[PDB]
Amino acid sequence: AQLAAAFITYLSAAPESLRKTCLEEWTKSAGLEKFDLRRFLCTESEQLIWKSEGLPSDDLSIENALVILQSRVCPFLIDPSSQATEWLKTHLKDSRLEVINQQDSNFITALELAVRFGKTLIIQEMDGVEPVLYPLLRRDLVAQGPRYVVQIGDKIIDYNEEFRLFLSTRNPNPFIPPDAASIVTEVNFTTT
Amino acid sequence: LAELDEYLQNLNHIQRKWVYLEPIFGRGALPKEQTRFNRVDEDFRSIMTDIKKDNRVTTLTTHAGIRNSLLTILDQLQRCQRSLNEFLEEKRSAFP
Amino acid sequence: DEGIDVKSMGRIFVGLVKCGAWGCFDEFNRLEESVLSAVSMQIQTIQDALKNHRTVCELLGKEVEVNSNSGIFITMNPAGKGYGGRQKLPDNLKQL
Amino acid sequence: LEVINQQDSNFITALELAVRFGKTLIIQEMDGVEPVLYPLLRRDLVAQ
Amino acid sequence: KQYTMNPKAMPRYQLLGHIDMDTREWSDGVLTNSARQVVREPQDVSSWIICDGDIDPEWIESLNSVLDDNRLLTMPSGERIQFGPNVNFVFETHDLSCASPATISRMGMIFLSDEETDLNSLIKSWLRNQPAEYRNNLENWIGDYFEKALQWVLKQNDYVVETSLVGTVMNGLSHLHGCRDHDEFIINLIRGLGGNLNMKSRLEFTKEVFHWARESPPDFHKPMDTYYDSTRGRLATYVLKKPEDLTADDFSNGLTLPVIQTPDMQRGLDYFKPWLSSDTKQPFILVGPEGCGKGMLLRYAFSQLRSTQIATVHCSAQTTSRHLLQKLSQTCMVISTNTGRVYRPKDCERLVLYLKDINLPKLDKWGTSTLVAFLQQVLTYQGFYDENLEWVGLENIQIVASMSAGGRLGRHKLTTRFTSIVRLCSIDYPEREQLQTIYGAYLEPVLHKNLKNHSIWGSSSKIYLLAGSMVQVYEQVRAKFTVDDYSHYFFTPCILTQWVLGLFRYDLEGGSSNHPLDYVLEIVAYEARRLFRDKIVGAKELHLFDIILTSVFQGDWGSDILDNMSDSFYVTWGARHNSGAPGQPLPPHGKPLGKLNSTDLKDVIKKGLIHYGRDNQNLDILLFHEVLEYMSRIDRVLSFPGGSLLLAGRSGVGRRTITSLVSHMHGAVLFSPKISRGYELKQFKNDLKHVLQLAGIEAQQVVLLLEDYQFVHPTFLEMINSLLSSGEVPGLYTLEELEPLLLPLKDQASQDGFFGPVFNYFTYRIQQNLHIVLIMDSANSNFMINCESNPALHKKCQVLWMEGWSNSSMKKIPEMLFSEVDPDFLKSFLLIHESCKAYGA
Amino acid sequence: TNTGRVYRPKDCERLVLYLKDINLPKLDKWGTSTLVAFLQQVLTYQGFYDENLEWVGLENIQIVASMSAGGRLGRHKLTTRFTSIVRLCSIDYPEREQLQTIYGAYLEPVLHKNLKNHSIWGSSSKIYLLAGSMVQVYEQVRAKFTVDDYSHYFFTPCILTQWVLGLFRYDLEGGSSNHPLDYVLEIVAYEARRLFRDKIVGAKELHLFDIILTSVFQGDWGSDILDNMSDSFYVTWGARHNSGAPGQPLPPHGKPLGKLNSTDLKDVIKKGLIHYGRDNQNLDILLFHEVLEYMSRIDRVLSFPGGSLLLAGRSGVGRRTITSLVSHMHGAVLFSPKISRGYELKQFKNDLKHVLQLAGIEAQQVVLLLEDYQFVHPTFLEMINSLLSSGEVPGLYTLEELEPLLLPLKDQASQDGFFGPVFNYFTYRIQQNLHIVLIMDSANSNFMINCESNPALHKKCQVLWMEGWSNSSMKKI
Amino acid sequence: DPSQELQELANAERSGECYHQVAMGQGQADLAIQMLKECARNGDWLCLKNLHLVVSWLPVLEKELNTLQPKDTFRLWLTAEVHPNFTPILLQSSLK
Numbered sequence A: 001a002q003l004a005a006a007f008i009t010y011l012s013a014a015p016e017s018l019r020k021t022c023l024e025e026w027t028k029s030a031g032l033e034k035f036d037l038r039r040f041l042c043t044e045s046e047q048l049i050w051k052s053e054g055l056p057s058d059d060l061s062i063e064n065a066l067v068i069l070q071s072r073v074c075p076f077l078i079d080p081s082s083q084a085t086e087w088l089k090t091h092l093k094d095s096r097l098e099v100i101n102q103q104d105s106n107f108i109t110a111l112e113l114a115v116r117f118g119k120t121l122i123i124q125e126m127d128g129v130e131p132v133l134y135p136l137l138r139r140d141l142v143a144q145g146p147r148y149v150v151q152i153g154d155k156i157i158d159y160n161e162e163f164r165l166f167l168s169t170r171n172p173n174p175f176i177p178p179d180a181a182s183i184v185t186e187v188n189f190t191t192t
Numbered sequence B: 001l002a003e004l005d006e007y008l009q010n011l012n013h014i015q016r017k018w019v020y021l022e023p024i025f026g027r028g029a030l031p032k033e034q035t036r037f038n039r040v041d042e043d044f045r046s047i048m049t050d051i052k053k054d055n056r057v058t059t060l061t062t063h064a065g066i067r068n069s070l071l072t073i074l075d076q077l078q079r080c081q082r083s084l085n086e087f088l089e090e091k092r093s094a095f096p
Numbered sequence C: 001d002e003g004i005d006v007k008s009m010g011r012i013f014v015g016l017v018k019c020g021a022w023g024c025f026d027e028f029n030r031l032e033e034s035v036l037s038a039v040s041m042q043i044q045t046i047q048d049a050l051k052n053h054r055t056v057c058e059l060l061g062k063e064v065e066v067n068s069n070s071g072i073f074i075t076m077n078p079a080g081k082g083y084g085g086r087q088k089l090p091d092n093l094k095q096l
Numbered sequence D: 001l002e003v004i005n006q007q008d009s010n011f012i013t014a015l016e017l018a019v020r021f022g023k024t025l026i027i028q029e030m031d032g033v034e035p036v037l038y039p040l041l042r043r044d045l046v047a048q
Numbered sequence E: 001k002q003y004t005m006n007p008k009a010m011p012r013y014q015l016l017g018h019i020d021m022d023t024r025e026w027s028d029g030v031l032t033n034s035a036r037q038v039v040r041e042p043q044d045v046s047s048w049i050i051c052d053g054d055i056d057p058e059w060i061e062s063l064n065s066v067l068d069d070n071r072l073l074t075m076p077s078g079e080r081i082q083f084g085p086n087v088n089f090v091f092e093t094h095d096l097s098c099a100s101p102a103t104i105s106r107m108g109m110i111f112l113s114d115e116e117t118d119l120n121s122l123i124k125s126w127l128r129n130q131p132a133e134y135r136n137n138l139e140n141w142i143g144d145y146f147e148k149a150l151q152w153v154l155k156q157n158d159y160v161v162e163t164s165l166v167g168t169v170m171n172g173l174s175h176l177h178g179c180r181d182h183d184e185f186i187i188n189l190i191r192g193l194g195g196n197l198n199m200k201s202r203l204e205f206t207k208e209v210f211h212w213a214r215e216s217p218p219d220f221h222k223p224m225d226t227y228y229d230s231t232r233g234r235l236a237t238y239v240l241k242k243p244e245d246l247t248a249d250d251f252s253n254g255l256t257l258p259v260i261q262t263p264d265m266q267r268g269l270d271y272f273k274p275w276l277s278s279d280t281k282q283p284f285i286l287v288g289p290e291g292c293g294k295g296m297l298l299r300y301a302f303s304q305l306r307s308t309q310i311a312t313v314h315c316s317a318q319t320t321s322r323h324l325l326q327k328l329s330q331t332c333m334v335i336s337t338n339t340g341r342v343y344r345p346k347d348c349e350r351l352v353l354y355l356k357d358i359n360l361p362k363l364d365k366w367g368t369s370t371l372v373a374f375l376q377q378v379l380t381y382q383g384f385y386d387e388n389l390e391w392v393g394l395e396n397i398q399i400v401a402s403m404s405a406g407g408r409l410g411r412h413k414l415t416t417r418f419t420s421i422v423r424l425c426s427i428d429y430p431e432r433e434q435l436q437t438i439y440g441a442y443l444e445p446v447l448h449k450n451l452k453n454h455s456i457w458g459s460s461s462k463i464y465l466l467a468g469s470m471v472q473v474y475e476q477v478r479a480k481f482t483v484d485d486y487s488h489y490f491f492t493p494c495i496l497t498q499w500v501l502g503l504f505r506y507d508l509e510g511g512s513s514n515h516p517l518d519y520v521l522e523i524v525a526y527e528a529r530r531l532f533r534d535k536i537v538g539a540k541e542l543h544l545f546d547i548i549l550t551s552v553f554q555g556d557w558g559s560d561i562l563d564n565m566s567d568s569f570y571v572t573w574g575a576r577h578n579s580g581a582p583g584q585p586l587p588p589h590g591k592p593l594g595k596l597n598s599t600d601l602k603d604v605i606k607k608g609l610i611h612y613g614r615d616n617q618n619l620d621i622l623l624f625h626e627v628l629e630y631m632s633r634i635d636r637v638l639s640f641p642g643g644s645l646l647l648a649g650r651s652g653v654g655r656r657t658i659t660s661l662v663s664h665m666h667g668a669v670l671f672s673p674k675i676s677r678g679y680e681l682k683q684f685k686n687d688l689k690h691v692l693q694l695a696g697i698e699a700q701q702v703v704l705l706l707e708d709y710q711f712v713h714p715t716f717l718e719m720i721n722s723l724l725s726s727g728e729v730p731g732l733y734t735l736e737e738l739e740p741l742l743l744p745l746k747d748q749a750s751q752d753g754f755f756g757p758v759f760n761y762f763t764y765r766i767q768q769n770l771h772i773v774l775i776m777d778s779a780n781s782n783f784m785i786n787c788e789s790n791p792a793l794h795k796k797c798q799v800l801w802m803e804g805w806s807n808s809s810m811k812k813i814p815e816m817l818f819s820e821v822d823p824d825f826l827k828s829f830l831l832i833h834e835s836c837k838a839y840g841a
Numbered sequence F: 001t002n003t004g005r006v007y008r009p010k011d012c013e014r015l016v017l018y019l020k021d022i023n024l025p026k027l028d029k030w031g032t033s034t035l036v037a038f039l040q041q042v043l044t045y046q047g048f049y050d051e052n053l054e055w056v057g058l059e060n061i062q063i064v065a066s067m068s069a070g071g072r073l074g075r076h077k078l079t080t081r082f083t084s085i086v087r088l089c090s091i092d093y094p095e096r097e098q099l100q101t102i103y104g105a106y107l108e109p110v111l112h113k114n115l116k117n118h119s120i121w122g123s124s125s126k127i128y129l130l131a132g133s134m135v136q137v138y139e140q141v142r143a144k145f146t147v148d149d150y151s152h153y154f155f156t157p158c159i160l161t162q163w164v165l166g167l168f169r170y171d172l173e174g175g176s177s178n179h180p181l182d183y184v185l186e187i188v189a190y191e192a193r194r195l196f197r198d199k200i201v202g203a204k205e206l207h208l209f210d211i212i213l214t215s216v217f218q219g220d221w222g223s224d225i226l227d228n229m230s231d232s233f234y235v236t237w238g239a240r241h242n243s244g245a246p247g248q249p250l251p252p253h254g255k256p257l258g259k260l261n262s263t264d265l266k267d268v269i270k271k272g273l274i275h276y277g278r279d280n281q282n283l284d285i286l287l288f289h290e291v292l293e294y295m296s297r298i299d300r301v302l303s304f305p306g307g308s309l310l311l312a313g314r315s316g317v318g319r320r321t322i323t324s325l326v327s328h329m330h331g332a333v334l335f336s337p338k339i340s341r342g343y344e345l346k347q348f349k350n351d352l353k354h355v356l357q358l359a360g361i362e363a364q365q366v367v368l369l370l371e372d373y374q375f376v377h378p379t380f381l382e383m384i385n386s387l388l389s390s391g392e393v394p395g396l397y398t399l400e401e402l403e404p405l406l407l408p409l410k411d412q413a414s415q416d417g418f419f420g421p422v423f424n425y426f427t428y429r430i431q432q433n434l435h436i437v438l439i440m441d442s443a444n445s446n447f448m449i450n451c452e453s454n455p456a457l458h459k460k461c462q463v464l465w466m467e468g469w470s471n472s473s474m475k476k477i
Numbered sequence G: 001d002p003s004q005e006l007q008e009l010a011n012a013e014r015s016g017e018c019y020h021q022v023a024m025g026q027g028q029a030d031l032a033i034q035m036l037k038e039c040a041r042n043g044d045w046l047c048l049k050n051l052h053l054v055v056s057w058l059p060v061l062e063k064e065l066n067t068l069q070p071k072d073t074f075r076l077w078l079t080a081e082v083h084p085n086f087t088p089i090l091l092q093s094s095l096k
């Protein structure tokens, strides 16, 4: 569990040589030089079902799709070619979903509906970290009796418990400051 | 003298601009301009009639509050200039 | 000077192509840089209208009548070691 | 259930809790129709 | 017919004219108007448009078509104004380093030199302006003493602000008129000349002047301090004047501190006294190193006056014409005489504009500030071109400005046009034997407002010895640290003043008679620790600072006095007489403090944390030693009247969480602007009007909170810089929106005793009732620029250095996530994190 | 000056205080008003004791006041001290041969701004005859009704003036050349119907009024002209050139009107009702003939510049429901003060400052709404009486709080041509841009007192008499 | 100067003057987007020029390149200069 947590909470950003070197150093640090983790954390049937949809079959793509098990924070998809995003909005068909663009006319209205109704939300063309989305990405929940409300600009909006937010990106740089990167975990689809 | 200087140095402006803007609104009368310029015409000719009565130069220091009359006539002439912008561009397109 | 509007240069060009006079645009160097870029399209349109013996050119929407005995020139220095703040002219615009 | 008196110090606070939590509310010492309780007695429900 | 422009003071679009961008409407300008006025005139005229100002090519090349073989001025609209055979342009200037040779070949030229000037031919007319009661002695003494002392100063050339010859002459002369005898005239000559030198040369200047005078004074040791009296004919005794009026009621205002009349303050006052009298209307500028005593001493000399009206304006890197214009026009009449409208001070005789900083405003890319060009226009021509096309004069205004020596960055140098018009001198740091006396005479009464009649405290050799120890600390800390390390190792005696006025806050009661050395010395060491220590970055420097502090306390008395009080937490939450929330006006030294324990503070924190999680998000806050430290340090600064913080640390650590909790526990309202899509500056102005209205009308204690993600437009730091430093936000309110808002304040203004207009009372209430919190990330790229480009942003607010938890506490965190092999897991966590710090952790 | 401080008119020579009503202020229990005693002091001694203990004179002020004859209630009599100091006379009602000429010379141009060159309209004997017919109507209605019936059978020629200036609103275009008698006479009869008829209480009086109206139209021309247009609804929602919401300044005669149908108005109502129930409570509103009538009558008065209503009816019937819907369909903001425990008058003053600021600065068309349960302090009707009658609320703002607020109005004041100070322009914008709705229950005990004790509360606003559904529609529900 | 070769190519391969071009400067961007959409619908060509001055405009350009649905025979021709701080995304999706 230490190795499986350390991989998720650190190494979804580094290139794969740093993944190999750090996993080998940690694995020799524990002393169990066998005992891989992609079979420890997922089994064969889920892998072939993920492959049945359009997930790329590399080690990098499958480990990146394993890291978005994380729900403590928001995942951040650095993704030059849109296959992984097509896969994620394929196998998130079952729950409620809306997908919106960044430079879109109805952004804040649809954002209000997605916070209220309890949707699972995917954002397409992010150029960085929006100024609006800071208390929602953090935890800012003032209570009104049994429920909780969260600040979006000027409105006061009920934070539905079924709120799940993902967002895509088309260029590895732009844009993170060192303040909106300690709360957002970053995943880089890369051709290796 | 501080009052009399400003009064004369406004009244010469008003005289020159009124002499300018009489014939244009006289010839091509558009009534939305005409009501404006008729009110300015009344407010100027009413002063000049009382000057025709008494022509002593220190009577303008002792009229019935002429200061706001002069400033308002100047301001309305500025506004009818801003209305005349479009006709100016018409005549500039006319003669090169 | 000062970086005036491209519409402000456009109306000057309209006057020059309607009258028939040589603009001797002294100090064409010191002008704001993107204004030069839009002016390049303007000058190219006028010179096309001259070379093809056109009677009716068209910039800023209207159909401005261009004159056959027209002409445009500039004068400038190269931005040398001590000629102050002057910006370098575009390559496209030099080709005109 | 909560039961409250009319001339009571915590009237509007407990009224807010009874509207939010979904209580069944009984008021004791009413001297008429309160000015406060008119849209709640009517139907005045703006949707969010 | 003369028309006089000054082309650098006003902006360009007013000078040469410009166009409204959306309306297509030609606004006129100054010299376009002047050109129309000259081409109106008939053929029998002549006119000289004069541009008495410095030269930049990007405006002076706009007149190439005027100064041509052709004679024509062109508008950008296409309107072109000719000129006849009459007009001339005359360009008074300083130099032509920055003019292109098109203009230099375009116009005529007159040269002048420093060899053609005749100094005696300007001494004689000044002597002719003398009232014929001293002129015999003055001419007899000038003609054989003046030229030697002038040429020796021009030989040394170690003078701190650059002037021309004429400037040195006038600085020599304007401290003279009214001498009686020879021995007084010597000292007036010394105070005239040697003010512009520095202390390496002023001493031998005095040596050569007294030696090539008649005799030597009895001030043979430190001859800078000779006090010639008219009463006896005394030459020199330097005497110390000790006050004996000392309570805690003097220290009630943070300003108006009791000035201890040391000999250097007497030298400063003897300098000031000839120029601020009502016969010599002189503008002058002090020079001092930063934090030395300029503003206090100049306010004392303001208070010595008769019928003046002081109006201090803090200038900075954004201060322009309109800011000083509105600071004048709030307190100045508008009376319409002949020859143009003019401004006159209301209800007084000599209004004084006190400009705080002159080095600090901003050059353009040639080297000419518009501020100093504007003040050059005023001090030369007594007027300015107000907008709406009308000259406006001034009537009775001095300008007494201040500055620091141009050592650091952000300190531009001044032009020699503005320097040699007006007067100046310099002063030095109060040295150690002086500062021991200052802070001994501060440390005796603030102590002796209690336990005055007891055993060891009293017999003020010990009170002197404590002050000498703290001076030794301050000197060795300035010896071991510099500004080349980081942006903010600030060290002035403002720190010592805030330090020794901190001691009102503590229960020093001593009725239960202690040891009692340790009970007050540990108090002293903790206050010194939380002032000096908490801004040092590196750990090895922290250990060196500990060695310094301990070596001082052991060299003063024995050993082992600081030993073990690291578990102490002097917090508001518990003191004598139950500190304990009502009482919305603040005490003059904040809420008093007292000793506590760790675990008891834990229970107080848990109680307030439960009460916070009632009406907020329920918080899963852990506890370890560092969070206790951080909350104690935030309480002991937010319980100060007018305190603010700069929280420099890593991301992710709780800072807004602890400050929100302390803001709830002290009942202060916390406010932070919630950004949206359409961020503007109008938004931010309305939110600042909200906060300023609440905190400066309703006397409520407010905490303002701005973090990194909200600075979405680059003027926000400048507005916060002003609102920290002064107390106002410049150009925020209009004139009409101050009287229906400040109208309910005249009553308390009448009852409290505060005089002047209502706006100073409003600003004073804002300075007492508003706290600012800045959370800024350490390793952002723009942190160095936004700590160097706003100097009050690390002079006003205390700067805590939050970066980095211990090695010890990161071991203890999973052990509190354990119940809520054992040590091998925990030490494995530490090693994984310490290896992963090399990528951003 | 010397001998005490004094007041003098700025920029003029003879300031004139024009006091509108003198009978109307209030006696004490002996018979002496403080107002008339104060004006007696001024017209005798040219000064007054200002407070803070100092006499203050006046310099150049006339007082030219007005009054009505002391016939009705609320009209006190004046003391003989104030009467024989100053001058007076009297004048009489313009009689019928005069009023025929007045309204003939009004009815000729407002007609002849269109169809001036056509068949029957023109040759102004007929224009005179229409005015004579309306004068005959007005005279017989004043002959058959009085003020002893109820508080509000008001009949002055202000009604005839508002009536014949109503006719700007209608598409009287006549380019498609009609009969054309019926097309304009039915327009005239409908406007007369919705002005005179809708304030008569008893049903038998309604039938008598119908006999009067029909007997006039038949005695003037033949018979059977009004016959069957009871299904008509002249509403904003549909006219010539697509009346159809932007355009926040109002037209000088309101939005123009046009002919419709019943079922088409039903669809327009259903569309706006769907759009209302989107962002509000979803409404289960039924439809029958009377609700169509009521919504037409609310639209054709709320689409007038400066209109207000007094809704006198039983409880329980929908009135706030229909007015909220029409306020949403015309895009006007609807505002009603939400009462709490600590009701005061300071609360109400702040809410009126809010509404007056919005409606008199930002040129927005506003509907204000006050009902019975909110009048929780007995000065509220008096403030609403003033704000209806004049346009101001007296003693509301101070002096310092008018210049930083009216300061952005001098520019449009300069451009529009309106002179004098800025405050008259502010009051004129409020008079053009603010609507007041009063819902009051009929059989409350205090209804008679609060219709008699505020006379402008039934002179300013049109009073619809909503009480009682039909026998026919309660069968259809 | 590439402009003459592009002009001769547009005269050779196409006829009826389908060639449309806009330079980039102060006040031309918001009509450049409109002409981009219109000549994407028409299928005619478009030649933008000087994309090294307007560096804070190119995110709008790459957004509109990603968004639009072109026709056949549409050809977008760019012209830029060597410039640091350029945007990679349109450099990915272009020939050079």
Ligand SMILES: Nc1ncnc2c1ncn2[C@@H]1O[C@H](COP(=O)(O)OP(=O)(O)O)[C@@H](O)[C@H]1O
Pocket (backbone or CB within 6 Å): E257, E259, E260, E262, E265, E289, E290, E291, E292, E293, E294, E295, E296, E430, E438, E493, E494, E497
């Ligand atoms: N002679 C003195 N006696 C006591 N305190 C002094 C003396 N000189 C300077 N100080 C302290 O130094 C501070 C000087 O502030 P000042 O130099 O006016 O600030 P600034 O440099 O920003 O103008 C004063 O607040 C005062 O407490």
Ligand SMILES: Nc1ncnc2c1ncn2[C@@H]1O[C@H](COP(=O)(O)OP(=O)(O)O)[C@@H](O)[C@H]1O
Pocket (backbone or CB within 6 Å): A138, A139, E620, E621, E622, E623, E627, E650, E651, E652, E653, E654, E655, E656, E657, E658, E775
């Ligand atoms: N000492 C602590 N114990 C428990 N949780 C903490 C502690 N410090 C910070 N946190 C966590 O940090 C989060 C808040 O971080 P925040 O204060 O927003 O960081 P920053 O101050 O850098 O913006 C909270 O969710 C809280 O759980």
Ligand SMILES: Nc1ncnc2c1ncn2[C@@H]1O[C@H](COP(=O)(O)OP(=O)(O)O)[C@@H](O)[C@H]1O
Pocket (backbone or CB within 6 Å): D042, D043, F284, F285, F286, F287, F291, F314, F315, F316, F317, F318, F319, F320, F321, F322, F439
């Ligand atoms: N014509 C109608 N059709 C259906 N429901 C109606 C109608 N008129 C009134 N109601 C009912 O009346 C209620 C609103 O009454 P309300 O307008 O508050 O009465 P009042 O106007 O006397 O205060 C609504 O719940 C509505 O269902």
